[PDB]
A paper describes a structure:
The Ang-1 domain of the HupE/UreJ-2 protein from R. bacterium (hereafter RbAng-1a), excluding its transmembrane (TM) region, was cloned for recombinant expression in E. coli. Dissociation constants (Kd) determined by TSA were 73.6 ± 2.3 nM for Cu²⁺ and 220 ± 10 nM for Ni²⁺, suggesting physiological relevance for both ions. RbAng-1a was crystallised in the presence of Cu2+ and its structure resolved to 1.9 Å using molecular replacement with an AlphaFold2 (AF231) model. The copper-binding site of RbAng-1a lies on a flat surface, where Cu⁺ is coordinated by the N-terminal His1 and the O atom of Asn41 in a T-shaped geometry. The RbAng-1a Cu-ligand bond lengths range from 2.1 to 2.7 Å, and the copper ion is three-coordinate. The geometry suggests a Cu+ oxidation state, following photoreduction of Cu2+ in the X-ray beam.
We report the method of signal strapping, where sequences of N-terminal signal peptides artificially appended with a histidine residue at their C-terminus are used to bootstrap a proteomic search. We exemplify the approach by the discovery and characterisation of four classes of bacterial metalloproteins, including two that we denote as anglerases reflecting their potential to capture transition metal ions from the bacterial environment.
Residue numbers in the entry: 1 to 168
Write the structure that this text describes.
């Protein structure tokens, strides 16, 4: 199965953080090192991915809800060096019966930023492959190509994050 970048949509509405991950769950659950992987068929866990592909959409979801600790452990948001713990609120899985096609899984993550937050850093592990982190709800917002370790700092919208320059 061709490996595509995960896509992450990050939005803040004051202190409320949403991160929505568009991803392929099957490699992440099988434990496959996705770093420099173009196709899961060229990895040792190919059969493990393909067994996971065979499950119904409801089974895949409950397995994602059941293993969130392992899956989300190395995914972190910090803001001013304070950890911003993420909750898994919701899980979608596309229903594609053709087993030779990958299906998208979406994770809906939320947290609360500290009072007065101005920047956050997202950390994604190299083992999970590329993440294209897009900041939503802002003109000329942050884009990042996360291949392992911390993002560059993401500048936040909203009243708390504003700074008045010393002169106009
Ligand atoms: Cu395959
Ligand atoms: Zn590695
Ligand atoms: Zn939906
Ligand atoms: Zn909004």
């Amino acid at each position: 199965h061709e490996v595509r970048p995960a896509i992450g949509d990050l939005e803040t509405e004051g202190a409320e953080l949403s991160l929505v991950l568009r991803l392929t769950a099957e490699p992440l659950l099988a434990g496959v090192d996705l770093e420099g992987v173009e196709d899961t068929n060229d990895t040792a866990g190919s059969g493990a991915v393909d067994q996971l592909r065979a499950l119904a959409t409801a089974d895949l979801m409950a397995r994602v809800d059941a293993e969130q600790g392992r899956l989300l452990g190395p995914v972190s948001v910090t803001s001013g060096g304070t950890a911003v713990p993420l909750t898994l609120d919701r899980v979608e899985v596309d229903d594609i019966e053709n087993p030779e096609l990958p299906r998208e899984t979406r994770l809906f993550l939320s947290g609360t930023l500290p009072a007065g937050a101005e920047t956050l850093v997202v950390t994604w592990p190299a083992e999970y492959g590329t993440l294209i982190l897009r900041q939503q709800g802002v003109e000329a917002g942050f884009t990042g190509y996360l291949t392992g370790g911390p993002s560059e700092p993401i500048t936040l919208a909203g009243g708390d994050a504003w700074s008045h320059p010393q002169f106009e």
